[PDB]
Design an enzyme around this catalytic site. Sequence first.
Site, PDB file in Angstrom:
ATOM      1  CG  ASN A   1       0.276 -11.067  10.326  1.00  0.00           C
ATOM      2  OD1 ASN A   1      -0.240 -12.010  10.998  1.00  0.00           O
ATOM      3  ND2 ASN A   1      -0.345  -9.910  10.116  1.00  0.00           N
TER       4      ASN A   1
ATOM      5  CB  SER B   1      -4.397   0.829  -0.669  1.00  0.00           C
ATOM      6  OG  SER B   1      -3.335   0.262  -1.421  1.00  0.00           O
TER       7      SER B   1
ATOM      8  CD  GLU C   1       2.938  -4.876   7.036  1.00  0.00           C
ATOM      9  OE1 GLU C   1       4.186  -4.920   6.969  1.00  0.00           O
ATOM     10  OE2 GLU C   1       2.316  -4.076   7.798  1.00  0.00           O
TER      11      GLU C   1
ATOM     12  CG  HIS D   1      -8.516 -12.597   1.463  1.00  0.00           C
ATOM     13  ND1 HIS D   1      -9.785 -12.921   1.895  1.00  0.00           N
ATOM     14  CD2 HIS D   1      -8.213 -13.483   0.482  1.00  0.00           C
ATOM     15  CE1 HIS D   1     -10.228 -13.960   1.208  1.00  0.00           C
ATOM     16  NE2 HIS D   1      -9.295 -14.319   0.345  1.00  0.00           N
TER      17      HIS D   1
ATOM     18  CG  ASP E   1       0.439  -5.857   2.687  1.00  0.00           C
ATOM     19  OD1 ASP E   1      -0.405  -6.758   2.807  1.00  0.00           O
ATOM     20  OD2 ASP E   1       0.328  -4.738   3.237  1.00  0.00           O
TER      21      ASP E   1
ATOM     22  CD  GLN F   1       7.488  -5.824   6.182  1.00  0.00           C
ATOM     23  OE1 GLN F   1       6.409  -6.321   5.874  1.00  0.00           O
ATOM     24  NE2 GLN F   1       8.630  -6.353   5.818  1.00  0.00           N
TER      25      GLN F   1
ATOM     26  CE  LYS G   1       1.070  -6.406  10.202  1.00  0.00           C
ATOM     27  NZ  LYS G   1      -0.218  -7.010   9.753  1.00  0.00           N
TER      28      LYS G   1
ATOM     29  CB  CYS H   1      -8.731  -3.223  12.392  1.00  0.00           C
ATOM     30  SG  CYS H   1      -7.795  -3.934  10.975  1.00  0.00           S
TER      31      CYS H   1
ATOM     32  CG  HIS I   1      -1.725  -1.239   1.394  1.00  0.00           C
ATOM     33  ND1 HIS I   1      -2.754  -1.591   0.554  1.00  0.00           N
ATOM     34  CD2 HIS I   1      -1.635  -2.230   2.316  1.00  0.00           C
ATOM     35  CE1 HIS I   1      -3.264  -2.751   0.941  1.00  0.00           C
ATOM     36  NE2 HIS I   1      -2.603  -3.153   2.015  1.00  0.00           N
TER      37      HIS I   1
ATOM     38  CG  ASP J   1      -0.922  -3.532  11.278  1.00  0.00           C
ATOM     39  OD1 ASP J   1      -2.042  -3.954  10.934  1.00  0.00           O
ATOM     40  OD2 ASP J   1      -0.099  -3.092  10.452  1.00  0.00           O
ATOM     41  CG  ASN J   2      -2.889  -7.950  12.231  1.00  0.00           C
ATOM     42  OD1 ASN J   2      -3.017  -9.056  11.668  1.00  0.00           O
ATOM     43  ND2 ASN J   2      -1.829  -7.211  12.085  1.00  0.00           N
TER      44      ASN J   2
ATOM     45  CG  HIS K   1      -3.832   0.119  10.304  1.00  0.00           C
ATOM     46  ND1 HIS K   1      -3.178  -1.086  10.450  1.00  0.00           N
ATOM     47  CD2 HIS K   1      -5.143  -0.174  10.140  1.00  0.00           C
ATOM     48  CE1 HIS K   1      -4.069  -2.066  10.391  1.00  0.00           C
ATOM     49  NE2 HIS K   1      -5.259  -1.535  10.183  1.00  0.00           N
TER      50      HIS K   1
ATOM     51  CB  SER L   1      -0.224   0.097  -4.312  1.00  0.00           C
ATOM     52  OG  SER L   1      -1.072   0.056  -3.158  1.00  0.00           O
TER      53      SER L   1
ATOM     54  CB  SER M   1       3.493  -2.774  10.841  1.00  0.00           C
ATOM     55  OG  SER M   1       2.359  -2.947  11.686  1.00  0.00           O
TER      56      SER M   1
HETATM   57  N1  NAD Z   1      -7.225  -4.186   6.193  1.00  0.00           N
HETATM   58  C1  NAD Z   1      -6.180  -4.219   7.033  1.00  0.00           C
HETATM   59  O1  NAD Z   1      -5.472  -3.099   7.354  1.00  0.00           O
HETATM   60  C2  NAD Z   1      -5.710  -5.492   7.639  1.00  0.00           C
HETATM   61  C3  NAD Z   1      -4.863  -5.484   8.763  1.00  0.00           C
HETATM   62  C4  NAD Z   1      -4.370  -6.720   9.212  1.00  0.00           C
HETATM   63  C5  NAD Z   1      -4.757  -7.913   8.612  1.00  0.00           C
HETATM   64  N2  NAD Z   1      -5.589  -7.859   7.504  1.00  0.00           N
HETATM   65  C6  NAD Z   1      -6.131  -9.064   6.859  1.00  0.00           C
HETATM   66  O2  NAD Z   1      -7.307  -9.338   7.619  1.00  0.00           O
HETATM   67  C7  NAD Z   1      -7.629 -10.741   7.531  1.00  0.00           C
HETATM   68  C8  NAD Z   1      -7.792 -11.335   8.923  1.00  0.00           C
HETATM   69  O3  NAD Z   1      -6.528 -11.202   9.582  1.00  0.00           O
HETATM   70  P1  NAD Z   1      -6.336 -11.669  11.089  1.00  0.00           P
HETATM   71  O4  NAD Z   1      -4.946 -11.324  11.463  1.00  0.00           O
HETATM   72  O5  NAD Z   1      -7.463 -11.198  11.927  1.00  0.00           O
HETATM   73  O6  NAD Z   1      -6.414 -13.278  10.924  1.00  0.00           O
HETATM   74  P2  NAD Z   1      -6.994 -14.308  12.022  1.00  0.00           P
HETATM   75  O7  NAD Z   1      -6.595 -15.645  11.522  1.00  0.00           O
HETATM   76  O8  NAD Z   1      -6.476 -13.930  13.359  1.00  0.00           O
HETATM   77  O9  NAD Z   1      -8.567 -14.115  12.035  1.00  0.00           O
HETATM   78  C9  NAD Z   1      -9.435 -14.558  10.997  1.00  0.00           C
HETATM   79  C10 NAD Z   1     -10.614 -15.233  11.699  1.00  0.00           C
HETATM   80  O10 NAD Z   1     -11.579 -15.540  10.689  1.00  0.00           O
HETATM   81  C11 NAD Z   1     -12.186 -16.758  11.100  1.00  0.00           C
HETATM   82  N3  NAD Z   1     -12.832 -17.361   9.928  1.00  0.00           N
HETATM   83  C12 NAD Z   1     -12.255 -18.019   8.868  1.00  0.00           C
HETATM   84  N4  NAD Z   1     -13.233 -18.379   8.010  1.00  0.00           N
HETATM   85  C13 NAD Z   1     -14.425 -17.971   8.524  1.00  0.00           C
HETATM   86  C14 NAD Z   1     -15.732 -18.092   8.104  1.00  0.00           C
HETATM   87  N5  NAD Z   1     -16.035 -18.725   6.958  1.00  0.00           N
HETATM   88  N6  NAD Z   1     -16.746 -17.548   8.858  1.00  0.00           N
HETATM   89  C15 NAD Z   1     -16.478 -16.919  10.068  1.00  0.00           C
HETATM   90  N7  NAD Z   1     -15.174 -16.806  10.515  1.00  0.00           N
HETATM   91  C16 NAD Z   1     -14.170 -17.321   9.742  1.00  0.00           C
HETATM   92  C17 NAD Z   1     -11.040 -17.608  11.677  1.00  0.00           C
HETATM   93  O11 NAD Z   1     -11.498 -18.634  12.550  1.00  0.00           O
HETATM   94  C18 NAD Z   1     -10.185 -16.546  12.361  1.00  0.00           C
HETATM   95  O12 NAD Z   1     -10.358 -16.537  13.776  1.00  0.00           O
HETATM   96  C19 NAD Z   1      -6.480 -11.371   6.754  1.00  0.00           C
HETATM   97  O13 NAD Z   1      -6.899 -11.459   5.386  1.00  0.00           O
HETATM   98  C20 NAD Z   1      -5.343 -10.366   6.901  1.00  0.00           C
HETATM   99  O14 NAD Z   1      -4.367 -10.432   5.862  1.00  0.00           O
HETATM  100  C21 NAD Z   1      -6.076  -6.681   7.029  1.00  0.00           C
HETATM  101  N1  RBV Z   2      -1.489   3.038   6.442  1.00  0.00           N
HETATM  102  C1  RBV Z   2      -0.989   1.936   5.875  1.00  0.00           C
HETATM  103  O1  RBV Z   2      -0.050   1.940   5.073  1.00  0.00           O
HETATM  104  C2  RBV Z   2      -1.565   0.607   6.221  1.00  0.00           C
HETATM  105  N2  RBV Z   2      -2.728   0.357   6.878  1.00  0.00           N
HETATM  106  C3  RBV Z   2      -2.894  -0.979   6.981  1.00  0.00           C
HETATM  107  N3  RBV Z   2      -1.819  -1.529   6.414  1.00  0.00           N
HETATM  108  C4  RBV Z   2      -1.376  -2.917   6.205  1.00  0.00           C
HETATM  109  O2  RBV Z   2      -2.191  -3.530   5.204  1.00  0.00           O
HETATM  110  C5  RBV Z   2      -2.062  -4.936   5.382  1.00  0.00           C
HETATM  111  C6  RBV Z   2      -3.181  -5.643   4.656  1.00  0.00           C
HETATM  112  O3  RBV Z   2      -2.861  -5.691   3.254  1.00  0.00           O
HETATM  113  C7  RBV Z   2      -2.130  -5.087   6.901  1.00  0.00           C
HETATM  114  O4  RBV Z   2      -1.393  -6.230   7.367  1.00  0.00           O
HETATM  115  C8  RBV Z   2      -1.542  -3.793   7.454  1.00  0.00           C
HETATM  116  O5  RBV Z   2      -0.270  -4.027   8.091  1.00  0.00           O
HETATM  117  N4  RBV Z   2      -0.966  -0.552   5.896  1.00  0.00           N
END
Ligand code: NAD
Ligand code: RBV
Lengths: 430, 429, 429, 430
Positions: free
Chosen positions: A179, A81, A154, A299, A129, A363, A184, A193, A53, A188-189, A351, A76, A359
Amino acid sequence: DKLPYKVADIGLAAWGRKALDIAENEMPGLMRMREMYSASKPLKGARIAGCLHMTVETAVLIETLVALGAEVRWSSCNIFSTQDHAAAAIAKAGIPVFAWKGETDEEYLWCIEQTLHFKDGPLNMILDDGGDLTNLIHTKYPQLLSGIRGISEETTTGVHNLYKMMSNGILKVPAINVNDSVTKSKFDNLYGCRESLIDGIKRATDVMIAGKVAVVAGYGDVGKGCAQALRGFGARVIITEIDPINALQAAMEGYEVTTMDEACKEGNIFVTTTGCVDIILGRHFEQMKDDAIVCNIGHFDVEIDVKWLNENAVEKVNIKPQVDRYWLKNGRRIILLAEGRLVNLGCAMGHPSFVMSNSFTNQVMAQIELWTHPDKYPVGVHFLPKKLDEAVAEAHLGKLNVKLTKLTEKQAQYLGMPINGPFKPDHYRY
Amino acid sequence: KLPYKVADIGLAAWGRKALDIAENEMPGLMRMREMYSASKPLKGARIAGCLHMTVETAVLIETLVALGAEVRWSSCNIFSTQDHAAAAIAKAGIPVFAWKGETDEEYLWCIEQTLHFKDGPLNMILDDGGDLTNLIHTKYPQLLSGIRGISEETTTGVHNLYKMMSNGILKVPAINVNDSVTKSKFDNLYGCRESLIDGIKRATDVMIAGKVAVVAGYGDVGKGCAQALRGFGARVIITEIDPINALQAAMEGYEVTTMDEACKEGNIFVTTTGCVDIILGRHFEQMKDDAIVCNIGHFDVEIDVKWLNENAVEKVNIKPQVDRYWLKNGRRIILLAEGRLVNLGCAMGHPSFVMSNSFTNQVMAQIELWTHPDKYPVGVHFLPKKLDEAVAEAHLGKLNVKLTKLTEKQAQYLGMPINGPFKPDHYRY
Amino acid sequence: KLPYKVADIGLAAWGRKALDIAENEMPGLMRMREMYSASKPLKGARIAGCLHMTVETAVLIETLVALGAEVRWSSCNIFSTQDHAAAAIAKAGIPVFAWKGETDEEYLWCIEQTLHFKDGPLNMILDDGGDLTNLIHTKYPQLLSGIRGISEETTTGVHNLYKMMSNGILKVPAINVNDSVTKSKFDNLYGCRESLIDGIKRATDVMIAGKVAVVAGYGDVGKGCAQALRGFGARVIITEIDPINALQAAMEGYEVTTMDEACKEGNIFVTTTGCVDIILGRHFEQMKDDAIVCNIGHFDVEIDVKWLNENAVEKVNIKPQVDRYWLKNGRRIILLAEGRLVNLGCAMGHPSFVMSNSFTNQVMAQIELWTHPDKYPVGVHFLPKKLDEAVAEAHLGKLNVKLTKLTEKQAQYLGMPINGPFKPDHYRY
Amino acid sequence: DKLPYKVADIGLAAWGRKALDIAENEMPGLMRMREMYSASKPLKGARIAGCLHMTVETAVLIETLVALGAEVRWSSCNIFSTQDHAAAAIAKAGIPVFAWKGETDEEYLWCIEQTLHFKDGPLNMILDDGGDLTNLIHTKYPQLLSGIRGISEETTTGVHNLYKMMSNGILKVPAINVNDSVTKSKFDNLYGCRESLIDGIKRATDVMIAGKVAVVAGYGDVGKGCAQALRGFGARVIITEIDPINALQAAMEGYEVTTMDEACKEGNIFVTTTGCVDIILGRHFEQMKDDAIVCNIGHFDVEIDVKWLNENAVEKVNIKPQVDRYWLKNGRRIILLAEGRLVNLGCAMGHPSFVMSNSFTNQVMAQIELWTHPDKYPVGVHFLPKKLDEAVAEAHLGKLNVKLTKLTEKQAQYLGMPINGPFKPDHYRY
Ligand SMILES: NC(=O)c1ccc[n+]([C@@H]2O[C@H](COP(=O)([O-])OP(=O)(O)OC[C@H]3O[C@@H](n4cnc5c(N)ncnc54)[C@H](O)[C@@H]3O)[C@@H](O)[C@H]2O)c1
Ligand SMILES: NC(=O)c1ncn([C@@H]2O[C@H](CO)[C@@H](O)[C@H]2O)n1
Ligand SMILES: NC(=O)c1ccc[n+]([C@@H]2O[C@H](COP(=O)([O-])OP(=O)(O)OC[C@H]3O[C@@H](n4cnc5c(N)ncnc54)[C@H](O)[C@@H]3O)[C@@H](O)[C@H]2O)c1
Ligand SMILES: NC(=O)c1ccc[n+]([C@@H]2O[C@H](COP(=O)([O-])OP(=O)(O)OC[C@H]3O[C@@H](n4cnc5c(N)ncnc54)[C@H](O)[C@@H]3O)[C@@H](O)[C@H]2O)c1
Ligand SMILES: NC(=O)c1ccc[n+]([C@@H]2O[C@H](COP(=O)([O-])OP(=O)(O)OC[C@H]3O[C@@H](n4cnc5c(N)ncnc54)[C@H](O)[C@@H]3O)[C@@H](O)[C@H]2O)c1
Ligand SMILES: NC(=O)c1ncn([C@@H]2O[C@H](CO)[C@@H](O)[C@H]2O)n1
Ligand SMILES: NC(=O)c1ncn([C@@H]2O[C@H](CO)[C@@H](O)[C@H]2O)n1
Ligand SMILES: NC(=O)c1ncn([C@@H]2O[C@H](CO)[C@@H](O)[C@H]2O)n1
């Protein structure tokens, strides 16, 4: 005869630089890496292709890698993003970057391909990532694998893919799972969020959260932060889960845990956090309350069946970029954010900088470990040592005016640990 | 004369889409349209409105028109107009004089455009903060006898009305909309709980978690603000002059201290007091580097912005409504919206659902004053509790709330009318 | 005649230790002693009190005596007396007729003992729930003309006073202590937020986390109860008849539905309504196995305890005030304190610090009625805001709260008296 | 010629049994172990010496072990934690138990010694909480070590000691770390303390929490739950920590993190959660606010310097059992709970039954694993497999009416996991 960079508008660079100046002062971890390593240049000789990103935060990471001696080329990992002023600042600094907000799928692939070839040879390091760069090299450019010293990855879905690649004999390059550094995943997660989900929903829709029912699919680190954010503003949050441990956590925190088959009838806001396909389907959309807002923070674009909306709606009305209101055959409307792609990065700014400093300090550390100590990292997937993980946290305490206690010699002896740590066993879950 | 004055009429189509979405979040206003669009109770009213020209306010404006009023509108803040909302109103043929980023002189000109209709001068005021009310009383007193009533939106505005009345200078009856239960305990509290952080985020993208936030005042707005910041992991410190509000904040787990102490600790400062001289030069000089300072209360006088402009050694505009100052001590201060309302100036104000509570009260107040003026002698009045309860009831269905009805046995036991009102006039909720 | 009647005078030394600890948590009451022990404003008063005979109430009693009153006391609930507190009062020479586990007839006998002093009949009433007030009006009307005033502690009691007044049957002036800001917004809310769970835990040791809890009513008590249960990880469902309270609960993230629906889901039921017929046989028959049912509102009429006793097929006493019923459907119900106030009946009631707010108001009310009776004609009155603010201020030092003082410039700007009161009479906090 | 049991009053057994009946219905995990294994009797031949708080919850555990075929002899691991009606019910059931509330230190040691010798021989299994039984055998009875098939250990301090014993070559018996099952550490230590800390403080003192400053030393699982409990009732919570990661978590949750040297001047309530010596000392007590309440929920009695109070106070006034009010030379008072021993168990009833069903289902599983599959467990410290950990959580979902989602075949393939789990990698932190 290749483009030196490609961004939306390099004239945004001055605004970008102001945003970077502010972010630097929120990112003490990255600034400490610069203070410690800008003179010794541990990444000298590294040619890092980055697929992450292209945000203000990532720009601070990029400039840190360059300060430490690396050559870098960047794209990216998401079509929505990029923050165009950040991309402009990086381009203006003479760093090859190929990223803009609102890429097509074809342009997206093209941008990654621009990061592979440097003046002095092909990439020799990957910073990824979601694993698209990792997968592109393994699938389309296997002849480049031998020249790559390491991969740092990541995000949860990315690292899941690395473990699967390793188990199936497909991974040919050592990787560090960033991750799952404590500093991290648990920060971060979760806390990232907790702020950036609502930011995305609000900028897109300006909807009131209070009084709504929000359905959060998944209760991992992301789902935990999303649920907490929504509850805090007065939504009633319903959780779905496949894992009985995560489900029990959710129940013990006071959330109703049920299936999407039931929850689709009640939710006003739907957030998918699972990293899994087929979470929200046609049979769910048809049962939703009018003007239900549906978004994904997990994802790619397969948690939500966006193809079903496009095929089955009477009409899709674009409200503004990344906000679409579908009118269904039942007369109700669905508001879909960012075409089902990451809502925090697609509809807001991702974030905030302070947590991204955790995070991204991981890296930088992973790039230094893989580049300078390759013997420690055979082909496989590895974690950063706990000492470095602790050091990431310690580097952020001063900005928050935290006063950490030091063990006395007597206490350190009593506990049987070193005064300077590490302080927890390897299995500790925090 | 101009039909309207807005930034860009080309924004009207997008504005209309936003209004369509907001209508579906504002069941109170839509119910007013359902009930009163045929009977047109506001027929004959010529309402001059001075209230943030947002998507939410556009829904209110079109409701007033649906009920038979003629309306002319201006914003009550130079940064709060949402240009697409203003464009949609203009496109619909309604005279609106409002854009984001007015000068102070343009601001006054806009209010002045709302005073005269084809059929005569305004005969109703809908005000937020008292500027329209004060303008007429001080500059156009010859128009007062032709105005049937004022309805006033916000705490600072109603404070001014009570002061005017006690001094014998209020000349038109007013309804205090702010202190409807369904306004003060909802808009001021839950609205700010969402829109303060929205303003801070759009302006700065700062992480809240881990910060110390100092909130001056712990009234309805300060309560909402403090809860928002705490929810994201800020440590919140409260200042207060009222021992009751102070004790509330302590009993909720907040440190309550003076700004003279808190200025040394805060990373984020939010003023909510409605009072002058809350954050001064002596405070700025002690603040942590890159402290973010903003106001959600009233006007621009809670924070001494004059002091920053005069005493900083550098001032850099980051983007609209975000300025970063460097002080002589080498540290930086980030000031939002030039010290004006941060939720409306740096974001989109309160979300539509809670604004439907406030604005349903506004429509009820306009109807009461226009159609029953003899019930409202010169002075400041509340809406009856029955109407206040009706506002809340009108929003329950959207949230799928199932309200219990008393049985006749229970109503007899309680000595309560079975359809309400259910609480005595002193009830505080 | 008896000097007192208590369970065990031998508990007096332990009682005194508990009173010593409580005094240090009750700065409002201790301040009343500091200010008024020499001047003795209550000299001549013969106060009959009917209020839970707890450690906290013992501190109030000794404060009244320190201010020159003669006092005779009874509890207002058959299970709420803390026997060590009662013993300490008795040992100090104060006539108290109270013990935990009274019969209904013993309860009435105890109130009757408080009516006659050596120097004549009572001339002041301090009441909690109206039983003493109603006893005199209905059975001893010949004593009414000799009573200067009533102060009343709780929502149900004040509701009864207003009803009496509207019906022309109230014959003595009363002060509504419940609706002091520093009582209703503190005791009813933060007190229940701590003492509901204390009652449920001491009775059952049940885990709260993971349960569904149903709270009937979302007034001050229901708000406190709901927050407590949610804080420990229960999912809380609310019932309400008032659309404003209902909308508040929805905006805080609670499901609001009817008891007819919620009875199928709850593991814990808490009634907070002050109303009859909240939990009935048709609800019990649908409840989850070992549902815990309790009341924190009024008397024993929110829950139909008669129905359980008549319809259960087994009833086992677990320990004092805890009964487990087996229904014909084979499922079990656990009923706390025979449906009487669970916080006072199964635990120790509200903690001393918040009771110091309520009881400082009580002492102020007694002083106002005794020393300024002409200010209080027959009817129901509030304490002035100045006094309400003073109660809060008296508790700030213990919590190390630092209150801001307005500057003269700010006070002029606000048009506010610099020492308060700081809010208008309609302010809801 | 030895006592068959020793309890405060066996006549409390009828009340005890009523409390056990209620607890059973809150403990579906233990009841499921009985349903599944009461006929096959996997623990037949086992002679289990147990050293664990003799509470109503523990009584349900004991009766489960006996239902599964074990012979058992029991003592408490704390001098104040026994619930005498529970001990009575177990004694009345013919099970040798040596436990009462308010033991002296000598009586405590004697009670453990009563659990070592059975009719058919010495103990051959240990179920321990805090390692006193483990340490007694290794130090005083090494000749019994060869006859012991396994140890299962309940708590963080206990398991810390097992790892230290193993690293120093002193451990001679295979052990399972029950504390670090996910369904123990992330539930018992966290949600259990979130309820039972306040219960202890309230029963002892009836103090208002709202408005107070509470200082919590440590921000591990226990400290996290304690802090949340106190904040929920409106205390302002200040945290102390030695670990920069835990400290950063606390700051990101909105707590002030500082040293005890600073926090002692402000706190009205002090709770120690560290498992470490010398947390609250004389120099701290002398600076505390009047009537500060001081308690320990971590380990033994050495977090708080109780010896300093006894030596330096002008007078100690006993308020009631386990509550003492010290008058210091500075004229201020300190209220000390349970002589500095575990406040939740000493002043209240410990964790509620539902969460103890998680911890104790892990205990039963560990006893079955060590007794029936010893080849899987060499001398060392081991965890339960994730599948069993998940099964503990699953067994508690029905009581809470949780509806768990099942992966579709398509989703399971997409994720690359089995439909029935396990669902997380070994390093997952939940
Ligand atoms: N948008 C962001 O900034 C951001 C940040 C961090 C992680 N992520 C992404 O977010 C997603 C989740 O990451 P995470 O670290 O929380 O993983 P995680 O494994 O800790 O949590 C995912 C949860 O989803 C549940 N799950 C799986 N399939 C399911 C279903 N069909 N119905 C209901 N629950 C289900 C699992 O049991 C698990 O507990 C990943 O794709 C990760 O790459 C995005
Ligand atoms: N501000 C930023 O650049 C940002 N925000 C969220 N994430 C990352 O985006 C990943 C999801 O693709 C996550 O694991 C986060 O670490 N990056
Ligand atoms: N931006 C918005 O969307 C929005 C929404 C509602 C109200 N408002 C405005 O916000 C302001 C606050 O409104 P409110 O309803 O909370 O009013 P309020 O009277 O309930 O609260 C203001 C509080 O500030 C305290 N205060 C006054 N001077 C102080 C000082 N010098 N230091 C510390 N505390 C001080 C008072 O004791 C009072 O408790 C008003 O100006 C009102 O018009 C803005
Ligand atoms: N146990 C205690 O320590 C304690 C403390 C304070 C007050 N009280 C008592 O608690 C009760 C509640 O007091 P409060 O101050 O919260 O009063 P309140 O009037 O603020 O709240 C009661 C609520 O119950 C709702 N209600 C009435 N009947 C209902 C029904 N049939 N179904 C659902 N909701 C219904 C009302 O709408 C109201 O909002 C009173 O009896 C009062 O005397 C007890
Ligand atoms: N009373 C109970 O019911 C109960 C329940 C579970 C665990 N425990 C006990 O509680 C204690 C803590 O257990 P846990 O699981 O939270 O362990 P933990 O390791 O997760 O947490 C302890 C924390 O204390 C911190 N710490 C160590 N020394 C410190 C010091 N001098 N100052 C400040 N912080 C310090 C550590 O950094 C660590 O984060 C252990 O003794 C454990 O056996 C008690
Ligand atoms: N979205 C909007 O139009 C909006 N948001 C907040 N306010 C009002 O702005 C007033 C302050 O001027 C408050 O009283 C609110 O009722 N209006
Ligand atoms: N600890 C105590 O003495 C106590 N606890 C609660 N209440 C009072 O009991 C009343 C209900 O009868 C409420 O209004 C409270 O003020 N008294
Ligand atoms: N009710 C009970 O029996 C109880 N409560 C807490 N603990 C255990 O006590 C141990 C500390 O000695 C912790 O690890 C908990 O698992 N047991």
